[PDB]
Amino acid sequence: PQAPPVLTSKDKITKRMIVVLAMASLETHKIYVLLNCDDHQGLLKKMGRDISEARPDITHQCLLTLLDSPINKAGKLQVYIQTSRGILIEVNPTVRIPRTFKRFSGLMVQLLHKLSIRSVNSEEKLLKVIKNPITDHLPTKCRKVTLSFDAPVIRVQDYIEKLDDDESICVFVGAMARGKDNFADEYVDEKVGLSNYPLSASVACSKFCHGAEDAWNI
């Protein structure tokens, strides 16, 4: 099938992997920039903020990792973003995330201000701010789990293979530098670890994609 239909929140049925990048650090400031600890340390200090929390680069790298993956190219992946200010974003699987941080910031600034980004020539949304909670958008049958260092370690393939034939898997991954992995406790009934080492979010995203790709023969 050279053309798998693009997965969106409107399909409640198709079995897929969903990744939610939670506590994402995406905040605009008119100086419009995305605030970040590399460029805006003095400012963040003056705002009384923990400098280390301003990490939009984490969300940027997780997006590049997830959207480049074989599972995305196979049409079996969705990504949502929950920012630390409570904004929910649905990412269209076909969207092109710029490699440079500068252009990613420009894109996110437009998204946060206009509330969507339309498809260039064709005219449907490539990124859209949507109403909370995430659970109004996920497939009807969908296992929900948080990835955490503090949790028992699983092999992704084992985990994925034990899903029912119609059951999606939604994984919540912290898009932050630090903090408790409690960001999705309202949504999940299970937490799993993927390694005996603390990982970056991009690595944890990558491990989970690889195990799904393997299990699903992608």
Ligand SMILES: C[S@@+](CC[C@H](N)C(=O)[O-])C[C@H]1O[C@@H](n2cnc3c(N)ncnc32)[C@H](O)[C@@H]1O
């Ligand atoms: C760099 S960690 C930051 C937050 C983490 N609680 C901490 O304090 O170090 C970013 C995210 O990657 C995931 N992660 C990090 N290590 C992991 C591991 N060993 N197994 C599963 N997920 C992990 C978690 O979802 C985590 O929130």
